[PDB]
Design a protein around this ligand. Structure first.
Ligand SMILES: *[C@@H]1O[C@H](CO)[C@@H](O[C@@H]2O[C@H](CO)[C@@H](O[C@@H]3O[C@H](CO)[C@@H](O)[C@H](O)[C@@H]3O)[C@H](O)[C@H]2NC(C)=O)[C@H](O)[C@H]1NC(C)=O
Ligand SMILES: *SC[C@H](NC(=O)CC[C@H](N)C(=O)O)C(=O)NCC(=O)O
Length: 115
């Protein structure tokens, strides 16, 4: 059985999947409580003998940093959605694995300095 790796060009149908994966992620990681999906960036499909996996790569924002003129923040997440090969839509993955990494304006280089 060959394994097929390719990309889905129309990512908008994965937006809800990204929203829900972030919701799940933040329920386990309290520092992420204020976070919201920015854009779905890329979706990769891997089709195997057993499952179809979709890897939904998405940007996030730390909305608590939109208040009080805080330092900006951004993150990238990947959600791995694993589907029964018989699934007819995206709504009900058998399981989901999510990781996220954050990029804080003030923790990198000299960009948070003054003249
Ligand atoms: C998203 O943005 C918010 C705001 O920057 C981040 O929450 C803040 O996280 C810092 C570091 O944990 C908190 O500071 C800590 O405060 C505790 C108690 O005050 C103190 O014991 C620690 O030494 C530390 O200074 C800060 O309170 C918290 N701020 C707010 C307003 O909630 C959050 O971490 C960012 N999320 C992620 C995933 O990066
Ligand atoms: S993180 C602050 C909120 N952002 C969003 O809800 C979506 C992400 C985008 N970066 C965007 O909105 O441009 C927010 O509260 N946005 C403005 C509002 O008051 O709705």
């Amino acid at each position: 059985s060959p394994v097929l790796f390719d990309f889905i060009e129309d990512t908008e149908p994965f937006r809800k999947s990204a929203d829900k994966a972030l919701e799940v992620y933040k329920s386990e990681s309290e520092a992420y409580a204020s976070f919201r999906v920015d854009r779905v960036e890329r979706v990769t499909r891997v089709k195997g003998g057993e499952r179809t996996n979709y890897y939904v790569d998405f940007s996030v924002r730390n909305c608590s940093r939109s208040h009080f003129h805080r330092h900006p923040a951004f993150g990238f997440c990947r959600a791995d959605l694993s589907f029964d090969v018989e699934a007819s839509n995206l709504e009900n993955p058998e399981d989901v694995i999510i990781s996220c990494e954050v990029f804080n304006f003030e923790e990198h280089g000299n960009i948070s300095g003054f003249r």
